[PDB]
Amino acid sequence: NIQNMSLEDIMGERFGRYSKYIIQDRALPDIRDGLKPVQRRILYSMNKDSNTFDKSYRKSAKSVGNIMGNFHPHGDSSIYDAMVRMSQNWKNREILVEMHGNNGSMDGDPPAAMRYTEARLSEIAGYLLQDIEKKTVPFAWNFDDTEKEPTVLPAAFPNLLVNGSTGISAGYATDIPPHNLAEVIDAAVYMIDHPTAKIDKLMEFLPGPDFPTGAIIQGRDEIKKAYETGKGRVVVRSKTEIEKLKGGKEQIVITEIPYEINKANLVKKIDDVRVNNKVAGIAEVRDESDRDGLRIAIELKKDANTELVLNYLFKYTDLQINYNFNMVAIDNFTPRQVGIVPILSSYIAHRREVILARSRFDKEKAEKRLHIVEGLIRVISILDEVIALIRASENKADAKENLKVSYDFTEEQAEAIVTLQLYRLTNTDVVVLQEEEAELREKIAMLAAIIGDERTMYNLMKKELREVKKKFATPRLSSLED
Amino acid sequence: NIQNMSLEDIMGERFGRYSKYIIQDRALPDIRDGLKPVQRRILYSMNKDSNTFDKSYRKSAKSVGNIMGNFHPHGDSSIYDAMVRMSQNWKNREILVEMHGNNGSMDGDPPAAMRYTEARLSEIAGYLLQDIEKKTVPFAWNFDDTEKEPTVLPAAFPNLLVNGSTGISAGYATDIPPHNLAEVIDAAVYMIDHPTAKIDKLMEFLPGPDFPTGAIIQGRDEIKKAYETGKGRVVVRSKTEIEKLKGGKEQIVITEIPYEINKANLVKKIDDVRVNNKVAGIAEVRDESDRDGLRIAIELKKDANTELVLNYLFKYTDLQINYNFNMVAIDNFTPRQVGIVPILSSYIAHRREVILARSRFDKEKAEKRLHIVEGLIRVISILDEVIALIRASENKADAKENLKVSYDFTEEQAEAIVTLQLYRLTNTDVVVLQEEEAELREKIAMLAAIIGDERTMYNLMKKELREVKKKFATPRLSSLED
Amino acid sequence: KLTPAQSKNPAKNELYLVEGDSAGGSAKQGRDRKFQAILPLRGKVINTAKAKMADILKNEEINTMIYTIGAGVGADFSIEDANYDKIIIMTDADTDGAHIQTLLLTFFYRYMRPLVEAGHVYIALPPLYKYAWTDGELEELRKQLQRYKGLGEMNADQLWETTMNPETRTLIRVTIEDLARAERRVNVLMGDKVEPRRKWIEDNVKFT
Amino acid sequence: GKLTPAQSKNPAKNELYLVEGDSAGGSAKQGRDRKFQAILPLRGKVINTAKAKMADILKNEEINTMIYTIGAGVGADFSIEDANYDKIIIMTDADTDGAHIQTLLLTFFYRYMRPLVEAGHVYIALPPLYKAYAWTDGELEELRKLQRYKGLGEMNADQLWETTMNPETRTLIRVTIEDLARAERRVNVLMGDKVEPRRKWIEDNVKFT
DNA sequence: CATGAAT
DNA sequence: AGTCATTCATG
DNA sequence: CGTGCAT
DNA sequence: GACTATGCACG
Numbered sequence A, B: 001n002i003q004n005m006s007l008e009d010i011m012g013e014r015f016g017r018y019s020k021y022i023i024q025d026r027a028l029p030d031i032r033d034g035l036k037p038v039q040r041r042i043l044y045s046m047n048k049d050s051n052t053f054d055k056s057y058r059k060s061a062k063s064v065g066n067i068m069g070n071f072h073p074h075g076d077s078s079i080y081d082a083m084v085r086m087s088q089n090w091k092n093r094e095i096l097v098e099m100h101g102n103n104g105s106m107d108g109d110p111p112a113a114m115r116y117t118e119a120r121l122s123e124i125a126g127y128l129l130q131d132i133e134k135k136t137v138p139f140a141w142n143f144d145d146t147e148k149e150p151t152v153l154p155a156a157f158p159n160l161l162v163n164g165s166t167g168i169s170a171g172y173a174t175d176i177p178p179h180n181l182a183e184v185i186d187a188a189v190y191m192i193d194h195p196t197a198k199i200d201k202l203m204e205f206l207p208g209p210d211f212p213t214g215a216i217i218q219g220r221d222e223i224k225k226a227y228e229t230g231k232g233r234v235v236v237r238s239k240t241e242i243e244k245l246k247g248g249k250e251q252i253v254i255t256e257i258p259y260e261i262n263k264a265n266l267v268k269k270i271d272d273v274r275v276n277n278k279v280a281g282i283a284e285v286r287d288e289s290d291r292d293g294l295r296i297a298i299e300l301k302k303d304a305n306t307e308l309v310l311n312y313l314f315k316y317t318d319l320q321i322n323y324n325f326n327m328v329a330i331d332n333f334t335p336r337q338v339g340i341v342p343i344l345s346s347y348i349a350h351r352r353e354v355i356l357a358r359s360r361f362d363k364e365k366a367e368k369r370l371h372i373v374e375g376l377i378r379v380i381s382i383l384d385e386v387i388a389l390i391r392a393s394e395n396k397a398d399a400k401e402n403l404k405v406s407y408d409f410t411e412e413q414a415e416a417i418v419t420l421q422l423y424r425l426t427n428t429d430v431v432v433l434q435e436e437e438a439e440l441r442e443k444i445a446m447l448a449a450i451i452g453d454e455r456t457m458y459n460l461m462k463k464e465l466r467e468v469k470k471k472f473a474t475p476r477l478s479s480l481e482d
Numbered sequence C: 001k002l003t004p005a006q007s008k009n010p011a012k013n014e015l016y017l018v019e020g021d022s023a024g025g026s027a028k029q030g031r032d033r034k035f036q037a038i039l040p041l042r043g044k045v046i047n048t049a050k051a052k053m054a055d056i057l058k059n060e061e062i063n064t065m066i067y068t069i070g071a072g073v074g075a076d077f078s079i080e081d082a083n084y085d086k087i088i089i090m091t092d093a094d095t096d097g098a099h100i101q102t103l104l105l106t107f108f109y110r111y112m113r114p115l116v117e118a119g120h121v122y123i124a125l126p127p128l129y130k131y132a133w134t135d136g137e138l139e140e141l142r143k144q145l146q147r148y149k150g151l152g153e154m155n156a157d158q159l160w161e162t163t164m165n166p167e168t169r170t171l172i173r174v175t176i177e178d179l180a181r182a183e184r185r186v187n188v189l190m191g192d193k194v195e196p197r198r199k200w201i202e203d204n205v206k207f208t
Numbered sequence D: 001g002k003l004t005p006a007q008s009k010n011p012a013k014n015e016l017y018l019v020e021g022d023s024a025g026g027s028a029k030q031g032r033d034r035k036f037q038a039i040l041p042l043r044g045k046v047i048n049t050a051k052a053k054m055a056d057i058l059k060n061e062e063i064n065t066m067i068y069t070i071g072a073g074v075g076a077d078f079s080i081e082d083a084n085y086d087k088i089i090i091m092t093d094a095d096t097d098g099a100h101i102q103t104l105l106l107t108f109f110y111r112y113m114r115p116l117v118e119a120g121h122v123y124i125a126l127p128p129l130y131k132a133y134a135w136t137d138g139e140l141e142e143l144r145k146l147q148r149y150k151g152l153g154e155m156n157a158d159q160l161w162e163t164t165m166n167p168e169t170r171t172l173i174r175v176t177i178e179d180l181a182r183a184e185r186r187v188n189v190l191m192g193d194k195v196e197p198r199r200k201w202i203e204d205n206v207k208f209t
Numbered sequence E: 001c002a003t004g005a006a007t
Numbered sequence F: 001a002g003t004c005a006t007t008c009a010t011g
Numbered sequence G: 001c002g003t004g005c006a007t
Numbered sequence H: 001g002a003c004t005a006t007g008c009a010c011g
């Protein structure tokens, strides 16, 4: 039967239960790889299934369900809506997912349902997962205890700043705008050398956000404020152009609008000005966006103050908005308001961790084989008595043992020797084996170096960051203005 | 530029396509496995995934997506709906899918969305799929051209009659009622011995339908008409009973009801008869069915004539209804009105192709193997020599030619020998190999018999049809009245 | 429901009758909004031949069609008051797409004969493979693959170039070239009566 | 009617079940004792009564059909005796979100129905975590002498009964407002308009590691 | 008024 | 295959 | 009508 | 996560 609890208690082991999970495991990105768990699971899964940029598209639903039975015990709607986002290029600066089909528009009409679309990781998402198979990142059990999943991706490029994040849990929210890839790399490259770098200097490399929708970002001092405390308010304003039409009438042509802003609503609200005559002079409001460009025409009446109209729209619509930084992320299992420094440093800390692990890993492998090759090179000198011995052996188990005790071989080697196919006995060419013993010695040095020279480690990390840059770098879309 | 089709001809081509497809590939079952293509796909996919009766459950959506991406290019809601049905023990006589959670009820309320449910094949569904790896059924390419699909399953029991179908194509439609597994088998066994059996002898083993809902079936004459032409109209009446009460107040208690009837509507529709007072003196209808029993109690009035109430309920509700046979299925690629005989025959016909295919497969397997074993028994007597000779060989290919030329081993034996791992040279006991040589000839023999002698094949068909019966047999639920 | 063309002009404008919102959405993105409207049809369309002209005027799909085609239906049908110059039917390459084409044509044949006998009713021909339409046009492209399971698995700019672009698209035009052999064709296949049809199927459909 | 009613109208043993989702909603209809147990599926996340306008709160279907199904009316217009159920039980997934829901509901059964809560009438069901069922990771080690329930929805209508709905085999947490004051502060801060007190509360009370 | 993972 | 509503923190 | 695969 | 409407053959 019953057991009583206080209203002051049952609201305690509940809301505190919710809070923690929603914060650690839901709405906030991990500062190192810039991913909320749903997204990281999406990417890990699609990758686990060879569903990548170089292979054919796979039906979205096949993917979605696999995620839901393997890692993300939640809505399939939630999972798909997330997968869809990672694939839309007016929300992501560097899209992680490629989706054949109707995945939406800037007019924000619904993406086709998951039964119609197919999808795969983008090439650059490969880079987020680069070297996962090498024990670089920490894993944990799935909700189900059937499979381990990574807690954070290797992140070969600094995603959390490049793509952005957003952003609503309990007790905290987050908004981090996207940034140009080349620039964020320059930044991190610099700071790899100068750990103790000033925001002012970093900002020579990272001048401010670069939304995928471009436009104009106004507010130098306010960017600094944000890059420094993580909170800041900047202005985002549309790219505008004016066209003198025949009749003395002018026309305002919009060609880029503010991040996160609905082109369809924006046109509506603008025309709703025209129809209420709040400011005077607007004649026709006409969207001319085709499949290969943004173009809104605002045809003003003859003789009408085009500055008064344009400014009216900036203040009273989303033709111009305020974008608020509120950069929060999960450093060390917990939510942290952070600016450009903790971010880049945390990323750098991570790459380091990663590159070390990665290197311990290949070196392990390279060791284990070098050890066997050493074994094999030796057997050749004593092939006859070894076949002889394996002959007089009772069984596999006794042959390894015998091999050891008779000739100093080790388990690892005894095994390799005792599982060679009879036809290996044809070969007697130590010279090919010796070329390999050499190659492996060299490989091991290079790695070992990396592991034990802090500096060596970083130039590698830089070498790699630059390659990422060279391959994926693209031009700014959003202009900056003091 | 535009081409001109005739309305007469465009309509011809288009309806023809739909017609044909929707007939052979949607609404009608294959006469041998009694499965519509989606049903078949579900089962096959689940099986390929090891999502079987013996292994864990599995989020439904995982399965559904896998099905929709490898085999069935249609809505995820169709797939799940069908997957759900196969798992509801009040629609299927012998459920093909087991599902944890909310699959619905006889009350007709909806199942849990596929995000909530998990599922796996039933033990017996296993049997529909038995021997499918063994190249026993014609495969075609999937819509993708990426993977092969079965076109019919092996069917270790005669699903078409046992679980029934239904059934709405174009030009044709189908309705086949469930049947008691044990009896359908008895029927097929007889017809295996007496090919020419006629309906009357047949009905001594297969008296008629056996709805999982149970109840009472009146109409022995129309059952034959059905088993004979394929159409026919039997009668299905609720299992009733009478309890007595205080004040001399009799009660009607219903415990079984007509296949395909919605318990809820049946209850309301009855209770409506009370409200409207369409027949004299009902007290109160009440569904008292709980998780382990069906119970609609119909309480009557103090001076209430129970035998008129009951008879009105039978005539003017679904408390008793007409089940119409309309046994259509797809024999040799086209729709066929078929009776108890064409059905039971095609099943034997099929089981035959299946047992032959399976037997050839296993036979070739044992043969290729016997061959290798013959090889190894020879080696052992010349082990030193063969080792010696390999050692003197140059690469692997040279070893094999040397083996051939010098000891008359065969390509396949040379390969086998030459690719044995060293430790094999320890367990060098021939008496054990000789045992396997024999076990294998015996096996090859028993199988060659089957292939060369129709009677020995049918004798298996029977042995096997009984095991299935012993293993899954159950009592009737529906009782018969002429 | 409908997406208009940015400019009324009953002589140049095209009305795209699309199969389901998802395809109807790829279309809303590929169109030349200046002269191409998009009306998406949600699910299998009502058989105007089997059902009662009563329940027929109660089907939202049909009402939102008689009203946007802007000429009423039946005998009260003002051919001249038409809204669009070309009415185009865009369905998946699949069978159910084929089925719909049927259901629609029967409507346009039965409750708007004038727009059909006027050669105003067209049928888009999406591509099967990827750019080749017929199985033969495929074998050719292998000399000098992605198969399409419906208009919905195609991307917006791909859609335009291949089916919606006037300069680059191939269209069929339903011409009633015999009011007798094109009536006995609709009533057999879409008629209330099932036997005739069961026969027609049995006579013309080769099941191999 | 969104609600599924009890067979016989006895507000003396009649229990009202507030279930999270139609998934478990139905799995709850099926598994119940229909003579005295009603089911009300809560479709969505129950509105925050402490955050929103008493205007908007009333125009919320999920709350209405509770004001109607409870049969007492909210506010001070609350007649704790003209109710319709002895015990009102909140049945949710044994998950994070289920917890969140247990919350939002409570705040409503306190903000706008204090009596029902003070009368020890509101409860909270206790579905199982493992399967031979257990409730805590410690009670599993004792059965080791192995299914894992991801919530009420992946549970079978017969199983949910023997385990959490049967008035004999079940265990119900019984909500009591022990100290009307130290309680008002907790509901007021967690579920309140003010963000900064919540933040601090999480920081001082939630252990991140 | 939105936002985006969640019910 | 869209439509409806709620959380949570922010300007 | 209500069925069950399909839109 | 429920609701909403169609086609098809059949009593």
Ligand SMILES: N[C@@H]1CCN(c2c(F)cc3c(=O)c(C(=O)O)cn(C4CC4)c3c2Cl)C1
Binding pocket: A075, A076, A077, A078, D043, D044, D045, E007, F004, F005, H001
């Ligand atoms: N008037 C009703 C109240 C509830 N409701 C909605 C709604 F509008 C949308 C969704 C929805 O998108 C969704 C999903 O899986 O993405 C899941 N659910 C259910 C899990 C709760 C929704 C619900 Cl209940 C509207």
Ligand SMILES: N[C@@H]1CCN(c2c(F)cc3c(=O)c(C(=O)O)cn(C4CC4)c3c2Cl)C1
Binding pocket: B075, B076, B077, B078, C020, C042, C043, C044, F001, G007, H004, H005
């Ligand atoms: N305009 C009408 C109103 C009702 N309607 C319906 C409807 F009632 C139910 C379903 C439905 O179950 C379903 C599914 O995948 O199982 C898919 N569809 C869509 C593919 C067509 C449905 C639609 Cl459109 C659309």
Ligand SMILES: [Mg+2]
Binding pocket: A077, A078
């Ligand atoms: Mg949703």
Ligand SMILES: [Mg+2]
Binding pocket: A313, A314, A315, A316, A317, A318, A319, A320, A321, A322
């Ligand atoms: Mg503004």
Ligand SMILES: [Mg+2]
Binding pocket: B077
């Ligand atoms: Mg449906």
Ligand SMILES: [Mg+2]
Binding pocket: B313, B314, B315, B316, B317, B318, B319, B320, B321
């Ligand atoms: Mg009757």
Ligand SMILES: [Mg+2]
Binding pocket: C092, C094, C096, C097, C149, C150
């Ligand atoms: Mg299709």
Ligand SMILES: [Mg+2]
Binding pocket: D093, D095, D097, D098, D150, D151
């Ligand atoms: Mg849950």
